[PDB]
Design a protein around this nucleic acid. Sequence first.
RNA 1: CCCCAUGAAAAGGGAGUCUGGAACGAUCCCGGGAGACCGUACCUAGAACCGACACUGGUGCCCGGGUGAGAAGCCCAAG
RNA 2: CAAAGCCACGAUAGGUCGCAGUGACCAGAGGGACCUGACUGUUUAAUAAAAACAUAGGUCCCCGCUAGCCCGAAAGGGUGUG
Lengths: 94, 234, 65, 77, 86
Amino acid sequence: FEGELKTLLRSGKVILGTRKTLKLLKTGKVKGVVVSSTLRQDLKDDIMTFSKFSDIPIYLYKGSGYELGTLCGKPFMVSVIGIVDEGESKILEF
Amino acid sequence: GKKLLQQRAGRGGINFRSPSWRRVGPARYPNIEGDHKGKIIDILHNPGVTAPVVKVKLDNGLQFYIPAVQGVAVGQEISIGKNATISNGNIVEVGQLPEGTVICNVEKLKGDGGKFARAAGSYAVISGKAGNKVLIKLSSEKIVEVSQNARATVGIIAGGGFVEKPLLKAGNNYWKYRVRAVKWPVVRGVAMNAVSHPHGGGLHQSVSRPSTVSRNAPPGRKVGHIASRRTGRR
Amino acid sequence: TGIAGRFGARYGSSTRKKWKEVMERRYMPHQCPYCKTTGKVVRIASGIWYCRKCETKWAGLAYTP
Amino acid sequence: SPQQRSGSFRKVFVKLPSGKSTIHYERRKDNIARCGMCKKPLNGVKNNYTYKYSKTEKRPERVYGGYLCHKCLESLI
Amino acid sequence: AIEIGRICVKTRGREAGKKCVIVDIIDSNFVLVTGPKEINGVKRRRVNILHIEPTDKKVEINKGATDQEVKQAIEQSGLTDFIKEA
RNA sequence: CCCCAUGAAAAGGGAGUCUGGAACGAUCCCGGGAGACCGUACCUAGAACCGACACUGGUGCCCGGGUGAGAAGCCCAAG
RNA sequence: CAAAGCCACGAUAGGUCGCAGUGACCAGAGGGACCUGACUGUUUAAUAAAAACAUAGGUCCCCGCUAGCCCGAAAGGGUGUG
């Protein structure tokens, strides 16, 4: 799993921050979004509600923003991740 | 002579009632007949309780208060009744419980509100199943019997490690009972005048009589070691 | 000995040491079970805790979450 | 009449061209009116120690505008 | 998704619950919409993207057309009173 | 920031939502009318209260300059 | 920022008077040995403030709520909104 992700950060385009991806996702212009378990529940439904409006695959992450951000490498946590380019990884099928 | 200090509390004067208006309310189980689901909306402190409480809204629109149970939060949902599972904070009946289950605030008879394991830090354990009722042990290692449909809550009431922190100061002790009707500070009697204490009087402060007395002893005279099984540090 | 002395030289060190050890656990940085250890939680009163991010009141122990 | 709380201890000498200095009492402040379920600090409603009979000015044009924000309110409609 | 001709609601504002029809996407954060003959008949007004909530019904309209065709397009779908049933 | 102290309740106001009613109709402004009854003097204390008194006792409460940390002491403003 | 007017504070040099330079006023004597009480606190109004009481703590006893504890004639009362 992590190897697949580590490839995306290497070259594939990524989006960090809910506001941008949530702005973007409603327009149906994202390859995929992965969310850690630590998302505030007020937004989780909206993602799930907006998930079916253009059928964008979503992976649920059991982790928090930290390990997601630790894998992301940013010192601070990331609640969600936005993708507009899979690049060369093999994640989208998930 | 003039009656005892314990005697004085028998009058039911001001010096012995509690200002429960400063308290949140009577926290006993509200009466329900079936199965219902509720959500926690608030937690407040209750002065003379030594344990936090919870305000919970009922799915049918009722307000009530129960001792707060460990690891439960605002907005979490609690189901109450027969169908409810074994989850922290859910209120169920003993008829569905397995052996060795950890619960608190056990109800004695159906619709009473719970009378045992309602303080802080304690818990209730199950030691068996009787012909018509259930075997329950409180922290005092004794056993009590309650009805089949008697209610209970799975979990532990908050307040663990309560007395580890030293009082360190009579001021703390003074504001620990500022609302509870305990007479504070407690005054010993052996130094008091004999006019108002059975063991009062005497220049050399000494025990006047063997403190142990027979069971038929009249009230106001039973003092000190009362019905002691044994003495000594060991 | 730090916090152990904030009352001066009173009441006995042995008492102070006991009051010492427990107190730090209250101020030792914890991990919010709801949002995360990101912010720090506070003990308003025995059993009362919430950090300033989750805004989730919950039941704690007398001095620990 | 005995030194009390009902009135902020004010005086008069700034905006003043005559020559005379004295004291006045005036009752305490209000806040946005009372009860509690969402404990949310409200906004956008007028609350003065007098009421100018301004109908909407004291209440937003939103659906529950005078009631509370959209933090704890989608349980009714 | 946010698509042209999908009937939708607005989280706030005077209408705050009335509907409008999506006509175009003027930018990544604003789109123009109009509830033409609501009980108030909200005039043609763009809005923030964080200000809408999509429904489960969509109507086929060309790029940013006028009131006459939506007047017919939705009644062609026969969703005239379903503005609130939306 | 502190709490094993968590720090009053009504009436009185204002708003929100749903039902019924009639079509006239105002929480707008403009003109008009009215708004019980009773408290209301004086003294607040080295002479107005109590202590048997025109009593160094108590019962109060609140509030300029300089010198000077200062409501300390001194002196002097208002009186 | 820095200049100007103000204003407070904190230092430097020099000269100079007297016995006296926190000039009045206001304003700790200090040190050592020992006993007792842990301390702040409280109380003999109008002969006594202390080592007398309370204290934080250790320790034991009673008791599973229709308990235990205590009060009244009785209804019952209060520790119990536990």
